[PDB]
PDB file of C-alpha atoms in Angstrom:
ATOM      1  CA  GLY A   1      61.198 -10.623 109.100  1.00 42.31           C
ATOM      2  CA  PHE A   2      64.489  -9.039 108.011  1.00 42.22           C
ATOM      3  CA  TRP A   3      66.387 -12.657 107.641  1.00 42.70           C
ATOM      4  CA  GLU A   4      63.593 -13.738 105.457  1.00 42.70           C
ATOM      5  CA  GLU A   5      63.513 -10.799 103.467  1.00 44.05           C
ATOM      6  CA  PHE A   6      67.274 -10.838 102.759  1.00 43.38           C
ATOM      7  CA  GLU A   7      67.247 -14.683 102.180  1.00 41.71           C
ATOM      8  CA  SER A   8      64.946 -13.767  99.328  1.00 40.63           C
ATOM      9  CA  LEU A   9      67.048 -11.373  97.765  1.00 41.96           C
ATOM     10  CA  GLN A  10      70.129 -13.744  98.154  1.00 41.39           C
ATOM     11  CA  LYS A  11      68.084 -16.387  96.292  1.00 43.13           C
ATOM     12  CA  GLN A  12      67.095 -14.116  93.518  1.00 45.31           C
ATOM     13  CA  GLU A  13      70.802 -13.245  93.268  1.00 45.17           C
ATOM     14  CA  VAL A  14      72.095 -16.533  92.069  1.00 43.33           C
ATOM     15  CA  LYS A  15      69.866 -16.138  89.198  1.00 43.75           C
ATOM     16  CA  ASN A  16      71.541 -12.704  88.738  1.00 44.55           C
ATOM     17  CA  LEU A  17      73.722 -13.390  85.686  1.00 46.02           C
ATOM     18  CA  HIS A  18      74.584 -10.295  83.593  1.00 45.27           C
ATOM     19  CA  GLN A  19      77.925 -11.166  81.904  1.00 44.97           C
ATOM     20  CA  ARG A  20      81.235 -10.371  83.678  1.00 42.29           C
ATOM     21  CA  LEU A  21      83.527 -11.140  80.923  1.00 43.25           C
ATOM     22  CA  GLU A  22      85.997  -8.410  81.418  1.00 41.01           C
ATOM     23  CA  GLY A  23      86.527  -9.000  84.920  1.00 42.72           C
ATOM     24  CA  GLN A  24      86.976 -12.706  84.229  1.00 41.38           C
ATOM     25  CA  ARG A  25      89.803 -12.100  81.773  1.00 38.98           C
ATOM     26  CA  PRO A  26      93.323 -13.546  82.714  1.00 36.33           C
ATOM     27  CA  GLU A  27      94.958 -10.567  82.009  1.00 37.61           C
ATOM     28  CA  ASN A  28      92.596  -8.753  84.787  1.00 36.93           C
ATOM     29  CA  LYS A  29      93.280 -11.455  87.386  1.00 35.57           C
ATOM     30  CA  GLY A  30      95.595  -9.134  89.635  1.00 34.68           C
ATOM     31  CA  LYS A  31      93.202  -6.260  89.423  1.00 38.23           C
ATOM     32  CA  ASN A  32      90.559  -8.084  91.451  1.00 38.01           C
ATOM     33  CA  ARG A  33      90.569  -8.221  95.248  1.00 39.58           C
ATOM     34  CA  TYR A  34      88.342 -11.180  95.197  1.00 37.99           C
ATOM     35  CA  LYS A  35      88.106 -13.440  92.306  1.00 41.55           C
ATOM     36  CA  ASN A  36      84.346 -13.930  92.481  1.00 41.04           C
ATOM     37  CA  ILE A  37      83.435 -10.057  93.146  1.00 43.36           C
ATOM     38  CA  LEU A  38      83.426  -8.737  89.469  1.00 44.66           C
ATOM     39  CA  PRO A  39      81.608  -5.670  87.565  1.00 49.91           C
ATOM     40  CA  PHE A  40      79.152  -6.393  85.270  1.00 53.10           C
ATOM     41  CA  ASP A  41      80.080  -5.713  81.722  1.00 54.47           C
ATOM     42  CA  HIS A  42      77.204  -3.565  80.686  1.00 53.95           C
ATOM     43  CA  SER A  43      77.671  -1.062  83.701  1.00 52.84           C
ATOM     44  CA  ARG A  44      81.605  -1.324  84.378  1.00 51.04           C
ATOM     45  CA  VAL A  45      83.607   2.002  84.396  1.00 52.26           C
ATOM     46  CA  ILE A  46      85.886   1.853  81.502  1.00 50.91           C
ATOM     47  CA  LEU A  47      89.228   3.426  81.830  1.00 50.81           C
ATOM     48  CA  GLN A  48      89.964   5.981  79.046  1.00 50.08           C
ATOM     49  CA  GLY A  49      93.167   7.014  77.372  1.00 48.29           C
ATOM     50  CA  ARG A  50      94.720   3.492  77.596  1.00 49.06           C
ATOM     51  CA  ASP A  51      96.573   1.166  74.850  1.00 46.28           C
ATOM     52  CA  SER A  52      94.113  -1.100  73.528  1.00 43.02           C
ATOM     53  CA  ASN A  53      97.017  -3.357  72.452  1.00 44.17           C
ATOM     54  CA  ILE A  54      97.840  -3.794  76.117  1.00 48.16           C
ATOM     55  CA  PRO A  55      95.262  -6.654  77.206  1.00 48.98           C
ATOM     56  CA  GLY A  56      92.809  -5.463  79.855  1.00 55.38           C
ATOM     57  CA  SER A  57      94.357  -1.797  79.916  1.00 56.60           C
ATOM     58  CA  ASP A  58      90.977  -0.348  80.246  1.00 55.28           C
ATOM     59  CA  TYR A  59      89.784  -2.443  83.319  1.00 58.82           C
ATOM     60  CA  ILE A  60      88.606  -1.187  86.772  1.00 57.40           C
ATOM     61  CA  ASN A  61      86.686  -3.298  89.259  1.00 57.08           C
ATOM     62  CA  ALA A  62      83.942  -0.606  89.690  1.00 58.34           C
ATOM     63  CA  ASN A  63      80.424   0.035  88.317  1.00 58.07           C
ATOM     64  CA  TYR A  64      78.166   3.007  87.679  1.00 56.79           C
ATOM     65  CA  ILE A  65      75.165   2.887  89.931  1.00 55.91           C
ATOM     66  CA  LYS A  66      72.021   5.070  89.454  1.00 60.13           C
ATOM     67  CA  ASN A  67      68.446   4.865  90.869  1.00 59.07           C
ATOM     68  CA  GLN A  68      66.803   3.030  87.772  1.00 53.50           C
ATOM     69  CA  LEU A  69      63.567   3.266  89.637  1.00 54.14           C
ATOM     70  CA  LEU A  70      63.026   6.879  88.919  1.00 52.30           C
ATOM     71  CA  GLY A  71      61.306   8.091  85.757  1.00 50.64           C
ATOM     72  CA  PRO A  72      63.686   9.590  82.771  1.00 46.66           C
ATOM     73  CA  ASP A  73      62.748  13.152  83.933  1.00 49.82           C
ATOM     74  CA  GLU A  74      63.645  12.756  87.453  1.00 45.87           C
ATOM     75  CA  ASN A  75      66.937  13.749  88.912  1.00 45.31           C
ATOM     76  CA  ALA A  76      69.254  12.217  91.380  1.00 44.55           C
ATOM     77  CA  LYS A  77      72.869  11.624  91.713  1.00 44.16           C
ATOM     78  CA  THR A  78      74.956   8.790  89.838  1.00 44.46           C
ATOM     79  CA  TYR A  79      77.638   6.958  91.930  1.00 42.04           C
ATOM     80  CA  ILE A  80      80.352   4.933  91.149  1.00 39.97           C
ATOM     81  CA  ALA A  81      80.781   1.548  93.362  1.00 40.55           C
ATOM     82  CA  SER A  82      84.207   0.556  93.539  1.00 42.20           C
ATOM     83  CA  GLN A  83      86.373  -2.006  95.256  1.00 43.95           C
ATOM     84  CA  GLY A  84      89.544  -0.621  97.302  1.00 44.57           C
ATOM     85  CA  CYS A  85      92.568  -0.375  95.736  1.00 48.02           C
ATOM     86  CA  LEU A  86      95.303  -2.740  95.564  1.00 49.67           C
ATOM     87  CA  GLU A  87      99.072  -1.594  95.181  1.00 51.68           C
ATOM     88  CA  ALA A  88      98.615  -2.452  91.344  1.00 49.83           C
ATOM     89  CA  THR A  89      95.350  -0.479  90.910  1.00 48.65           C
ATOM     90  CA  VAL A  90      96.002   2.758  92.800  1.00 48.07           C
ATOM     91  CA  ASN A  91      96.661   4.595  89.474  1.00 52.34           C
ATOM     92  CA  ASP A  92      93.520   2.989  87.994  1.00 55.66           C
ATOM     93  CA  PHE A  93      91.699   4.464  90.585  1.00 56.40           C
ATOM     94  CA  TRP A  94      92.964   8.135  89.873  1.00 56.24           C
ATOM     95  CA  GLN A  95      92.308   7.700  86.494  1.00 58.33           C
ATOM     96  CA  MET A  96      88.862   6.937  87.130  1.00 58.16           C
ATOM     97  CA  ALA A  97      88.434   9.734  89.548  1.00 57.48           C
ATOM     98  CA  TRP A  98      89.655  12.264  86.982  1.00 58.29           C
ATOM     99  CA  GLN A  99      88.185  11.042  83.658  1.00 56.52           C
ATOM    100  CA  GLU A 100      84.824  10.920  85.648  1.00 58.38           C
ATOM    101  CA  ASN A 101      85.158  14.365  86.925  1.00 58.29           C
ATOM    102  CA  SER A 102      84.318  12.851  90.626  1.00 60.17           C
ATOM    103  CA  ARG A 103      84.920  15.618  93.244  1.00 60.21           C
ATOM    104  CA  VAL A 104      83.750  13.516  96.583  1.00 59.67           C
ATOM    105  CA  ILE A 105      85.139  10.011  97.265  1.00 59.51           C
ATOM    106  CA  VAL A 106      83.304   8.073 100.059  1.00 61.75           C
ATOM    107  CA  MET A 107      85.527   5.448 101.564  1.00 60.13           C
ATOM    108  CA  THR A 108      83.628   3.098 103.917  1.00 56.26           C
ATOM    109  CA  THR A 109      86.575   0.932 104.943  1.00 58.63           C
ATOM    110  CA  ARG A 110      89.750   1.428 107.037  1.00 59.93           C
ATOM    111  CA  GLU A 111      92.932   0.392 105.299  1.00 58.30           C
ATOM    112  CA  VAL A 112      93.529  -2.447 107.612  1.00 58.04           C
ATOM    113  CA  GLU A 113      90.961  -4.110 109.925  1.00 61.78           C
ATOM    114  CA  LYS A 114      91.977  -6.445 112.758  1.00 59.26           C
ATOM    115  CA  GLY A 115      95.329  -7.235 110.700  1.00 57.57           C
ATOM    116  CA  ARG A 116      93.422  -7.932 107.521  1.00 58.49           C
ATOM    117  CA  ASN A 117      94.316  -5.762 104.436  1.00 61.82           C
ATOM    118  CA  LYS A 118      91.163  -3.703 102.947  1.00 62.91           C
ATOM    119  CA  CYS A 119      92.544  -0.909 100.923  1.00 61.73           C
ATOM    120  CA  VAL A 120      95.853   0.432 100.267  1.00 59.60           C
ATOM    121  CA  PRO A 121      95.977   4.261 100.697  1.00 55.29           C
ATOM    122  CA  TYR A 122      96.044   6.403  97.597  1.00 55.22           C
ATOM    123  CA  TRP A 123      96.513   9.589  98.981  1.00 54.86           C
ATOM    124  CA  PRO A 124      99.776  11.369 100.160  1.00 52.33           C
ATOM    125  CA  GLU A 125     100.196  12.576 104.151  1.00 54.66           C
ATOM    126  CA  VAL A 126      99.274  16.095 105.139  1.00 56.14           C
ATOM    127  CA  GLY A 127     100.886  18.867 103.194  1.00 56.21           C
ATOM    128  CA  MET A 128     102.632  16.446 100.801  1.00 57.52           C
ATOM    129  CA  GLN A 129     102.336  16.141  97.048  1.00 53.81           C
ATOM    130  CA  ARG A 130     102.813  12.834  95.151  1.00 55.55           C
ATOM    131  CA  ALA A 131     102.292  11.733  91.420  1.00 52.60           C
ATOM    132  CA  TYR A 132     100.062   8.569  90.814  1.00 48.39           C
ATOM    133  CA  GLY A 133     100.470   7.718  87.023  1.00 47.26           C
ATOM    134  CA  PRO A 134      99.722  10.839  85.096  1.00 43.37           C
ATOM    135  CA  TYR A 135      98.159  12.808  88.014  1.00 43.89           C
ATOM    136  CA  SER A 136      99.627  14.757  90.854  1.00 44.89           C
ATOM    137  CA  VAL A 137      97.721  14.706  94.285  1.00 47.65           C
ATOM    138  CA  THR A 138      98.387  17.127  97.203  1.00 48.96           C
ATOM    139  CA  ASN A 139      96.871  16.534 100.666  1.00 50.94           C
ATOM    140  CA  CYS A 140      95.760  20.079 101.637  1.00 49.35           C
ATOM    141  CA  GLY A 141      94.429  19.226 104.950  1.00 46.43           C
ATOM    142  CA  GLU A 142      92.725  16.743 107.176  1.00 48.06           C
ATOM    143  CA  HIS A 143      89.846  17.328 109.697  1.00 50.76           C
ATOM    144  CA  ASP A 144      88.501  14.585 111.813  1.00 52.37           C
ATOM    145  CA  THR A 145      85.366  13.565 113.752  1.00 50.94           C
ATOM    146  CA  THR A 146      84.927  10.611 116.086  1.00 53.87           C
ATOM    147  CA  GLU A 147      83.707   8.292 113.395  1.00 53.16           C
ATOM    148  CA  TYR A 148      85.197   9.851 110.187  1.00 53.29           C
ATOM    149  CA  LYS A 149      88.014  11.754 108.724  1.00 54.53           C
ATOM    150  CA  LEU A 150      87.785  14.265 105.650  1.00 53.99           C
ATOM    151  CA  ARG A 151      90.968  14.844 103.624  1.00 52.15           C
ATOM    152  CA  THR A 152      90.848  17.858 101.221  1.00 50.93           C
ATOM    153  CA  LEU A 153      92.821  16.875  98.168  1.00 53.26           C
ATOM    154  CA  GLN A 154      93.840  18.851  94.969  1.00 50.22           C
ATOM    155  CA  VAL A 155      94.536  16.820  91.932  1.00 51.57           C
ATOM    156  CA  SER A 156      96.146  17.998  88.584  1.00 53.82           C
ATOM    157  CA  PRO A 157      97.378  16.292  85.333  1.00 56.58           C
ATOM    158  CA  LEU A 158     101.178  16.239  85.211  1.00 57.38           C
ATOM    159  CA  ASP A 159     100.820  17.379  81.639  1.00 55.18           C
ATOM    160  CA  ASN A 160      98.414  20.209  82.700  1.00 52.34           C
ATOM    161  CA  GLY A 161      99.708  21.834  86.125  1.00 51.62           C
ATOM    162  CA  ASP A 162      97.773  24.749  86.006  1.00 50.34           C
ATOM    163  CA  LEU A 163      94.276  22.835  86.112  1.00 51.89           C
ATOM    164  CA  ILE A 164      93.564  22.133  89.676  1.00 53.39           C
ATOM    165  CA  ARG A 165      90.378  20.272  90.892  1.00 55.90           C
ATOM    166  CA  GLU A 166      89.677  20.188  94.629  1.00 57.40           C
ATOM    167  CA  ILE A 167      88.491  16.452  95.728  1.00 57.99           C
ATOM    168  CA  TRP A 168      87.066  15.929  99.081  1.00 58.13           C
ATOM    169  CA  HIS A 169      87.807  12.464 100.614  1.00 61.18           C
ATOM    170  CA  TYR A 170      85.439  11.279 103.394  1.00 66.35           C
ATOM    171  CA  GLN A 171      86.512   7.977 105.067  1.00 65.55           C
ATOM    172  CA  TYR A 172      84.152   6.361 107.693  1.00 62.15           C
ATOM    173  CA  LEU A 173      86.455   4.677 110.351  1.00 56.67           C
ATOM    174  CA  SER A 174      83.868   2.562 112.282  1.00 59.77           C
ATOM    175  CA  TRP A 175      81.939   0.335 110.005  1.00 59.49           C
ATOM    176  CA  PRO A 176      83.694  -3.072 110.071  1.00 58.35           C
ATOM    177  CA  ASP A 177      83.734  -5.246 106.869  1.00 63.58           C
ATOM    178  CA  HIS A 178      80.591  -7.710 106.913  1.00 60.33           C
ATOM    179  CA  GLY A 179      79.321  -5.648 109.709  1.00 61.44           C
ATOM    180  CA  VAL A 180      77.378  -2.632 110.587  1.00 59.69           C
ATOM    181  CA  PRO A 181      77.969   0.515 112.686  1.00 58.88           C
ATOM    182  CA  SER A 182      76.628   0.277 116.193  1.00 63.78           C
ATOM    183  CA  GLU A 183      74.136   3.273 115.774  1.00 67.11           C
ATOM    184  CA  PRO A 184      73.209   5.133 112.482  1.00 66.18           C
ATOM    185  CA  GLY A 185      73.822   8.623 113.490  1.00 66.34           C
ATOM    186  CA  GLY A 186      77.527   8.448 112.383  1.00 65.42           C
ATOM    187  CA  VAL A 187      76.534   7.568 108.892  1.00 65.32           C
ATOM    188  CA  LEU A 188      73.783   9.959 108.567  1.00 63.00           C
ATOM    189  CA  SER A 189      75.930  12.700 109.677  1.00 63.97           C
ATOM    190  CA  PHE A 190      78.702  11.428 107.324  1.00 63.50           C
ATOM    191  CA  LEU A 191      76.134  11.393 104.382  1.00 63.13           C
ATOM    192  CA  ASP A 192      74.503  14.758 104.974  1.00 64.61           C
ATOM    193  CA  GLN A 193      78.262  16.458 104.932  1.00 62.85           C
ATOM    194  CA  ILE A 194      78.678  14.470 101.559  1.00 60.86           C
ATOM    195  CA  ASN A 195      75.642  15.486 100.041  1.00 60.29           C
ATOM    196  CA  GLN A 196      76.157  19.133 100.950  1.00 61.49           C
ATOM    197  CA  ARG A 197      79.464  19.032  99.441  1.00 61.63           C
ATOM    198  CA  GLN A 198      78.264  17.417  96.283  1.00 57.70           C
ATOM    199  CA  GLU A 199      75.405  19.776  95.615  1.00 60.30           C
ATOM    200  CA  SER A 200      77.663  22.839  96.441  1.00 60.00           C
ATOM    201  CA  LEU A 201      79.371  22.139  93.332  1.00 57.11           C
ATOM    202  CA  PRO A 202      78.527  22.857  89.522  1.00 54.95           C
ATOM    203  CA  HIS A 203      78.182  19.620  87.637  1.00 59.78           C
ATOM    204  CA  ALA A 204      80.600  17.505  89.762  1.00 62.54           C
ATOM    205  CA  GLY A 205      80.595  13.878  88.340  1.00 62.20           C
ATOM    206  CA  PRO A 206      79.612  10.782  90.171  1.00 62.20           C
ATOM    207  CA  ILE A 207      80.330  10.368  93.767  1.00 61.53           C
ATOM    208  CA  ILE A 208      82.566   7.623  94.153  1.00 65.37           C
ATOM    209  CA  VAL A 209      81.776   5.207  96.766  1.00 67.98           C
ATOM    210  CA  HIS A 210      84.081   2.210  97.850  1.00 65.42           C
ATOM    211  CA  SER A 211      84.747  -0.209 100.521  1.00 68.33           C
ATOM    212  CA  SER A 212      87.094  -3.337 100.307  1.00 66.87           C
ATOM    213  CA  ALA A 213      85.269  -5.543  98.100  1.00 63.47           C
ATOM    214  CA  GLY A 214      83.157  -2.620  96.985  1.00 62.26           C
ATOM    215  CA  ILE A 215      79.704  -4.415  97.660  1.00 59.42           C
ATOM    216  CA  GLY A 216      78.884  -4.735 101.199  1.00 58.07           C
ATOM    217  CA  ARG A 217      79.381  -1.483 102.958  1.00 58.19           C
ATOM    218  CA  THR A 218      79.317   0.242  99.544  1.00 56.95           C
ATOM    219  CA  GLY A 219      75.902  -1.058  98.493  1.00 59.24           C
ATOM    220  CA  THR A 220      74.393  -0.469 101.968  1.00 59.10           C
ATOM    221  CA  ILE A 221      75.523   3.269 101.963  1.00 56.60           C
ATOM    222  CA  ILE A 222      74.474   3.752  98.529  1.00 53.20           C
ATOM    223  CA  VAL A 223      70.843   2.368  99.106  1.00 55.34           C
ATOM    224  CA  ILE A 224      70.769   4.505 102.322  1.00 54.81           C
ATOM    225  CA  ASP A 225      71.670   7.658 100.387  1.00 56.16           C
ATOM    226  CA  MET A 226      69.246   6.763  97.516  1.00 58.88           C
ATOM    227  CA  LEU A 227      66.325   6.386  99.875  1.00 60.52           C
ATOM    228  CA  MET A 228      67.489   9.675 101.749  1.00 61.19           C
ATOM    229  CA  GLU A 229      67.266  11.515  98.404  1.00 58.43           C
ATOM    230  CA  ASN A 230      63.869  10.341  97.683  1.00 62.10           C
ATOM    231  CA  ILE A 231      62.451  11.346 101.162  1.00 62.36           C
ATOM    232  CA  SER A 232      64.221  14.591 100.630  1.00 63.27           C
ATOM    233  CA  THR A 233      62.797  15.271  97.095  1.00 66.67           C
ATOM    234  CA  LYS A 234      59.324  13.728  97.361  1.00 69.09           C
ATOM    235  CA  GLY A 235      58.541  14.056 101.106  1.00 68.02           C
ATOM    236  CA  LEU A 236      57.699  11.674 103.900  1.00 69.59           C
ATOM    237  CA  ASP A 237      54.678  10.568 102.304  1.00 69.02           C
ATOM    238  CA  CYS A 238      57.007   8.684  99.604  1.00 70.54           C
ATOM    239  CA  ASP A 239      56.439   5.044  99.047  1.00 68.78           C
ATOM    240  CA  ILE A 240      59.741   3.226 100.295  1.00 68.76           C
ATOM    241  CA  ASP A 241      60.773  -0.101  99.140  1.00 71.50           C
ATOM    242  CA  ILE A 242      64.097  -1.100 100.356  1.00 73.43           C
ATOM    243  CA  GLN A 243      63.899  -4.666  98.688  1.00 71.91           C
ATOM    244  CA  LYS A 244      62.990  -3.376  95.473  1.00 71.03           C
ATOM    245  CA  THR A 245      65.854  -0.669  95.821  1.00 71.06           C
ATOM    246  CA  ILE A 246      68.430  -3.151  96.581  1.00 72.79           C
ATOM    247  CA  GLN A 247      67.342  -5.525  93.693  1.00 73.30           C
ATOM    248  CA  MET A 248      67.660  -2.666  91.380  1.00 71.28           C
ATOM    249  CA  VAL A 249      71.127  -1.687  92.590  1.00 71.02           C
ATOM    250  CA  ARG A 250      72.051  -5.447  92.221  1.00 71.43           C
ATOM    251  CA  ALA A 251      71.173  -5.153  88.548  1.00 69.27           C
ATOM    252  CA  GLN A 252      74.044  -2.836  88.303  1.00 69.16           C
ATOM    253  CA  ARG A 253      76.662  -4.586  90.376  1.00 69.83           C
ATOM    254  CA  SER A 254      76.724  -8.074  91.989  1.00 70.27           C
ATOM    255  CA  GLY A 255      76.001  -8.602  95.698  1.00 71.01           C
ATOM    256  CA  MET A 256      75.367  -4.936  96.806  1.00 71.56           C
ATOM    257  CA  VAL A 257      74.416  -5.150 100.583  1.00 73.10           C
ATOM    258  CA  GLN A 258      76.355  -8.271 101.875  1.00 72.64           C
ATOM    259  CA  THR A 259      74.918  -9.189 105.053  1.00 72.81           C
ATOM    260  CA  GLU A 260      71.457  -9.548 106.801  1.00 70.61           C
ATOM    261  CA  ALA A 261      72.633  -7.239 109.501  1.00 70.41           C
ATOM    262  CA  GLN A 262      73.530  -4.675 106.666  1.00 68.01           C
ATOM    263  CA  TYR A 263      70.087  -5.216 105.218  1.00 66.09           C
ATOM    264  CA  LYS A 264      68.259  -4.266 108.754  1.00 65.66           C
ATOM    265  CA  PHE A 265      70.854  -1.352 109.139  1.00 61.20           C
ATOM    266  CA  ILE A 266      69.308   0.326 105.867  1.00 60.66           C
ATOM    267  CA  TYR A 267      65.831   0.111 107.966  1.00 59.79           C
ATOM    268  CA  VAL A 268      67.356   1.472 111.022  1.00 60.81           C
ATOM    269  CA  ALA A 269      69.079   4.290 109.332  1.00 63.83           C
ATOM    270  CA  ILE A 270      66.353   5.461 107.279  1.00 62.90           C
ATOM    271  CA  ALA A 271      63.702   5.207 110.153  1.00 65.65           C
ATOM    272  CA  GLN A 272      66.216   7.571 112.132  1.00 64.89           C
ATOM    273  CA  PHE A 273      66.307   9.786 109.272  1.00 65.79           C
ATOM    274  CA  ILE A 274      62.590   9.910 108.892  1.00 69.19           C
ATOM    275  CA  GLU A 275      61.989  11.071 112.613  1.00 70.62           C
ATOM    276  CA  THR A 276      64.828  13.727 112.033  1.00 71.48           C
ATOM    277  CA  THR A 277      62.886  15.109 109.074  1.00 73.91           C
ATOM    278  CA  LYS A 278      59.699  14.772 110.914  1.00 73.85           C
ATOM    279  CA  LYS A 279      60.873  17.041 113.634  1.00 76.49           C
ATOM    280  CA  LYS A 280      62.848  19.593 111.602  1.00 76.47           C
ATOM    281  CA  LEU A 281      59.764  20.204 109.253  1.00 73.42           C
TER     282      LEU A 281
END
């Protein structure tokens, strides 16, 4: 069933041609990790404060994602789904985080996996402070579990050093690219911490979620989080439609949820989440 359902989504996805003009511009070639994995123009994050006479200066490979199945009077978080930093786009990443008021970053990849580069680091070591373009970032501490690391960051504009934002950086360590975690417990614990942190803030901006390509593990974890928010707010009676949720998310960024195993993992994770919610209440 799982293979057939995911195959069906893949077949629809070839017919998913929203324009991706900005990402395809020659001037932006070095800002994309994979030349076929690009943000839709209609939902791309546009970097502010840049010189429009520098071609492509506003560009980053990332999109706003929200649950567009919800009615306008309903309320659930907005996400940004981003690729992982290249050396040339680390400063772009920090401009995005700053301008969007993001207070939580969710990294679902390791920097290097099996000798293959996935994401360049964009934080300093513990206790250290480093400038990234116009922003200063200080690593104010690291706290680890078996499956993920939390780094507590402080970020300030160089031109405005008394304005300081705390940003919480959550990195999941055991979700391989094009693959799935061995069990869903780790991700569910991960997401619980992430949501607790986000909601404990007044008016934080969108949570930034990224992987390497910004579609597989990023798409899968966003869909899981969306379904958890639905269950949390509407109860266990809620109608859950994973296929419909994935196609809705794919209207906002191409190829979200990359493999049939990741598709199955959404079911596995949500089913475990449901049994947890059933017990507690």
